[PDB]
Structures are given as C-alpha cells and as structure tokens.
A = this chain, B = another copy of it.
Amino acid sequence: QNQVPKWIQLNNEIMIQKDGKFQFDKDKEAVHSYFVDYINQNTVFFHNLKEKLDYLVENQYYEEEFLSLYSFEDIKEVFKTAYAKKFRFPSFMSAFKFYNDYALKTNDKKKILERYEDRISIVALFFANGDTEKAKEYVNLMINQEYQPSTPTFLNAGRKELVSCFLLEVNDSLNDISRAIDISMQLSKLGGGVSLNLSKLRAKGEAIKGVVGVMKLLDNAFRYADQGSGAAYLNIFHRDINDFLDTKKISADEDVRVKTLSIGVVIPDKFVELAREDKAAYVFYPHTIYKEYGQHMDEMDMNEMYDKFVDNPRVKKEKINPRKLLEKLAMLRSESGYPYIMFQDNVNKVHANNHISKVKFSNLCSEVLQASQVSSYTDYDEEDEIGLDISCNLGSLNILNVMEHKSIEKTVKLATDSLTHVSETTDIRNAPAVRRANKAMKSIGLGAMNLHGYLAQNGIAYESPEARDFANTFFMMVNFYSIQRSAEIAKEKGETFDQYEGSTYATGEYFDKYVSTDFSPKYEKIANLFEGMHIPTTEDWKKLKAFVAEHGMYHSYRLCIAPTGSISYVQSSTASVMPIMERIEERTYGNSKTYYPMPGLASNNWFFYKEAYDMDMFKVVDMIATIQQHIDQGISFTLFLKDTMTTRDLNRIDLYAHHRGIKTIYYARTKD
C-alpha cells in the first residue's frame, strides 16, 4: 500500500526522536529489514559453492587462473573462514554501499551473485596466489575489518587492471602532448585517475617552427570516453599560472572552463618568501630558460636560481604581485574548491629519493608524492627516451579495529604483502614510462581510516593534544612495520627498488629522528591504549636501520593516506584521518531519504563527534602535521570552512599549513 520500503521507514525513524534522544536502535532494525525484505530476496540461487563457482567461471564473471592454483577442498575452507565470523552490518548505509556499489551482480544488472563474505574470500584467494593459509589470514584481516583494499582493488579483484591512480609527465612538444593525451585515454578506462604535469610546457606567446590548450584537449578527451576523471598540475612560477587558475572561475567562459579536470598548484618556499617580505614576483617563460640553461625550469632549484633568472636578459619574464596571487588562490578555493596546493619544499625536505628526482607534482587526490623523470616520444617509436612516470595501488588500515584486535604489526605487513602482490601482477602495455616505473620503483600506498571514530569512542577530542599524541605513536608504528616488511620482502626476494643505494634509507639519513628521539606517548591515558602491543623504542629503530642497510628495501614508497569517501561506509568508519562533516548525514535515496549517524554515535560521545566546520582548522593542521611525520608520501587534507571567513582568514590557514610542514592541501569544503 505504502511505496516507501520498510527499511527506509525504519531508517527515518532514527530522526523521529522520543525521550530526549535520537533512536539509534532503529538502524539495526532497518538494516535487518533491508536483508530479509530485499537483499536475501534478490540473491541468485545455487545448491552449493561448487555450483556457484562453476557458474561464475563458465559465464565469464570470475577469472580462470587464480582459482585453479587452489584445490576446491581448500577453497571451501577459505570461504568457510569468511562465513565463520557471522559478520553483521551495524547500519543501513554499510550494507547498502556494499551491496549497491561493490557486490557482483548478474549481466541483467539486478540479481545479487556475491555476499560480503564471497567478495572478501575471492579477494583473499587473489592475494595469496596459492598459499591457502595466507588466504585464511587475508579473510580474517578483511572480515574483522582490520584492512580494506581500495575501491578498484576490492571491486575488480578476481573478475574479468586493479591499479588505478597514475601520474604522467608531459614534455614540451606536440608528439609528447599527443601521446600524453592518448596514454590518458588508456589509463582512464583501466581504473580511473590520471594526473598530468604541465610545468614543462611552454607558455602562451612562445612560437614553434599555452597550457590551457592542453587542458582543453584533455577535458574534451576525458568527456569523449563517457571512466575515472583526470587532473593537471602547474608550478606557480609558470607564466600561464593565471590562465591556469581561471579555468575554475565561477564566472568563466564556456570554452576556457574545464569540467572533468581537477587542478593543482605547486608552490616552492621562494614564493612564500617573496610574499612575506612584500616584494614583487616574476613568473617565467620556461622554454626561454630551457634554451639558456639546458635544463627545464621544473627540474631546477628555484631557491637557488630565481635571482639568476631575473638578472638574465635572455630569460623572458612577467612581473606579478605574489600577495595578490595568494588571495586569488583563496578566492577560487572558496568559490569552487580548487585548486589543490602542494608546498614543494615541505615534500622534498623529508623525501628519500631526491637523487632520482625532486617531487614535482601530485595525483588526483593530492596524496601520491614520488620522484619522476620526463619521457621523449618521437615519430620513430624505437628512438624514444622512456622515463619514470608514477603508478601506485592503494589500501587503508582501520584504526579502530586494528587497536582493539591489537594487530598493528600484522595488519600493516599483510596489507603491505597484498599491495606488493597487486604491484607484481600489474601489466601495463601502452605506457612504457608507467610500465618501467612499476618494475623499477615498486611503489605502494598503505593509508588509514577511522581516526576520529576511534578517538571519539574513547572520549578523546580530535583537536586536543591527546589526540595528536595518539596519532604520533600510532603512525610511527605503521612506518616502523612497513619499513621492516619492505626489508623482509627485499631479503626474501633478493630485490630492491631501483637506485636504493642512493636513498636516505641506504645512507641512514632517514632514521636520524627515530634513532635520536622517542615517539612513545606522553600522556598516560594514551600509553594504556597501546597495552598488549610493543611500542618500538630508539634501540629497535637502530636495529631496523642496520637491517635495512644489509638487506635493502623492495619499496621506494610505502605509506599514503587517501580520502576514502565510499569504502569508509563499508567499514563503518569515519572517512580517512579527517574529522567528520556531519553527525547525521541526510542523503537522497530515490524520492525518499536516508539518515546515517556516524559510527558509534551516542549521548555518551555527542561532543567528541564534533563537526569539522566547528573546529579550529589551525589545530586540525597540527593533527595532519604530526601524522605527516611518519608517512613518506602525502595525506589528502580537506579544509572545512565557513561562509563567514574572509580571503584573509583563508590565507592565514593555508600559510600556517606551510609553516607547520604540510605537504599537500586537497578540496576546500565551505558551509553556511
């Protein structure tokens, strides 16, 4: 009679509050209704697991070979390990987000083929590659919700290329731009994220015998393929910087604006210096530097060479006010959310592989921060000079379940092992710089989520010195055991990342802080949270230094924290290490609406679940800064602002971030 489903009615009854409190009981009833009145009524029937796999293999849903490395007797034991837990989703959105987005369905995209246990088992069977007892550990890791592989790895593993997130580097030429566009199409379909570095390209007004032209070509190309979006990064000292920023003006033109492309700005310390002392700034025509000095502008140190570019008459320049350009960033970040900011020297001052290259730019989510070398694609393909692009596959720890299971070591190592397997199984063909990077650099991206949810459920405010003290110790341990496993893999395989000999891991310069100072918790309240787990001391780090020195390291880069917008719902976690935007999330379902309380929200902890826009973003910067200490790549840092804040107030946040050693700044969220 009534069209609104019973599970939606029960979900909405959370808000119809009685006593003087919201009915958090009703979401457990709502999810139960979702299963018995819908999900279980739309699951394809099979007699047993034998019939189920044979159906999916023979009808081209699942891949052929990864299953054949196990006997069926062991496959049943692995699947049985997943179902043994009797995992239950605590909320409607948890079950909905999995069964709507992640669970395998029929070709007539209606009926459900995979349960939550079947997905995890298949993914576990893909990672282990024949080791049946390893798959059992991967099942226990993923079903206890200690580890969560990223959207592309978790969705596609086992089916009929897992690594999303690529970063290309374009050289100044038509062959290079045309290939960079063609390679972006191949990597758009394969997963999603493509991020181009346009700092090498020549400015508008330099002839051949600007960068917006390439950004429009990219935007049109990404739109042609209906399929993840792309992005473009540019150095602030580039001439077209203004035209680049004007592509995300709210009052822009139809042809100059880009819809698909996100934009990032790379800011060296020299630009902040000029702003502090109120001097004028000069933006450069990079090809005039190339002809003069031999090297690209983007490859040279601006803190040494800026003055020399100014005094040289052979280099073409453009006078600008840096303080006014910083205001323009803040204006656009308020208006549109873009651009992303990268503080180049805050990345490179703590960077291990500067000898390979300086980190010049970042990816779609401002998280991946690695070295890279430009390619040179010619008419005769056999005369190409292939360089180093960046490709990185992702995954996230669950801070809450890792702490309670006391599995901070094991969860890092299995995650690192699974990420290494995804890296090993990757086969890229039409992107030789991306293929060479995967072989040589062997990069992975182990992040984390559920930081607020953990802190809020233990009565610890996100922006207090307690919360920051916990994160200091927690993420130190993540870095310790990640490095330890990287060396253990390098011993077991006898392989290291290309030019390991030159890195700060090899020279020992990386370990100086961990050898000298002690990162165990100051507050006694937080020391007790790690009870039952050995916190590494300085003496342990000295041994880990010597172990790395002798056996090398397999991974060039290891840790990076992603935004994790969607998979966080599957895990019942607060998204990433960020604070929470809303206590209750009202979202449209389909003419009805759904309400989602944050995980573990109650009258006990209502004020520990403080909304992000109400926080002091200076103290939020302090949290990311203390976490950044023990993450060798970047952290996707969303700023949460109010409509009342001036462009003066935003510059003060952005420059405090730079002052505190923040590597990257993501999307700027603003609220009424």
Give A contacts to B, CB under 8 Å.
Answer: 20-21, 275-276, 278, 326, 380, 382-386, 461, 463-464, 496, 498-502, 506, 549-550, 552, 603-604, 606-608, 610, 616, 618, 648, 651-652, 655, 659
B552 and A607: CB pair below 8 A?
yes
* In contact, B607 and A501 (Cβ under 8 angstroms): yes
A-B contact pairs, 25 of them (CB 8 A): A20-B550, A21-B550, A275-B380, A275-B382, A276-B383, A278-B380, A326-B382, A382-B648, A382-B651, A382-B652, A382-B655, A383-B659, A384-B652, A461-B499, A463-B499, A464-B502, A496-B607, A500-B607, A501-B607, A506-B607, A549-B604, A550-B603, A550-B606, A552-B606, A552-B607
* Cα distance A643–B552 in the bound complex, in angstroms: 24
C-alpha gap A435/B550 in the complex (Å) = 56
Q: How far is the CB of A383 from chain B (nearest CB, A)?
A: 6
Chain B residues within 8 Å of A651, by CB = 382
- Pairwise interchain contact B380-A276, C-beta atoms closer than 8 A: yes
Which residues of chain B come closer than 8 Å to A461, judged between CB atoms?
Answer: 499, 501-502
Return chain B residues, CB-CB under 8 Å to A608. 501
* 18 further contact pairs, Cβ within 8 A, besides A461-B502, A463-B499, A549-B604: A20-B550, A275-B380, A276-B383, A278-B380, A382-B648, A382-B655, A383-B652, A383-B659, A385-B618, A386-B652, A461-B499, A461-B501, A464-B502, A496-B607, A500-B607, A501-B607, A550-B603, A550-B606
Closest to A501 in B: B607
CA distance A604 to B552 in the complex (A): 11
Would you give the shortest CB distance from A40 to chain B, in whole angstroms?
Answer: 38
Q: Chain B contacts of A610 at CB under 8 A?
A: 501
Within 8 Å CB of A604, what residues of B?
Answer: 549
CA distance A404 to B326 in the complex (A): 58
Which partner residue on chain B sits nearest A276 by CB separation?
A: B380
B residues less than 8 Å from A20 (CB atoms): 550
The docked-state distance in angstroms from the alpha carbon of A607 to that of B554 is 13
User: Which residue of the partner chain, among B275, B382, B498, B552, contacts A616 with CB atoms under 8 Å?
Assistant: B498
Q: Give A549 to B616 CA distance when docked, in angstroms.
A: 22
Q: With a CB–CB cut-off of 8 A, which chain B residues contact A21?
A: 550
Q: How far is the CB of A508 from chain B (nearest CB, A)?
A: 12
Expressed in whole angstroms, the Cα–Cα distance for A604 and B608 within the complex equals: 51
Closest residue to A386 on the B side, CB-wise?
B652
CA distance A549 to B506 in the complex (A): 52
A278 proximity list for chain B (CB < 8 A): 380
Chain B proximity of A599: nearest CB distance (Å): 19
| CA distance in complex: A522, B659 (Å) | 37
Residues of chain B within 8 A (CB-CB) of A276 are 380, 383
Q: Which residues of B contact A383 (CB under 8 A)?
A: 276, 652, 655, 659
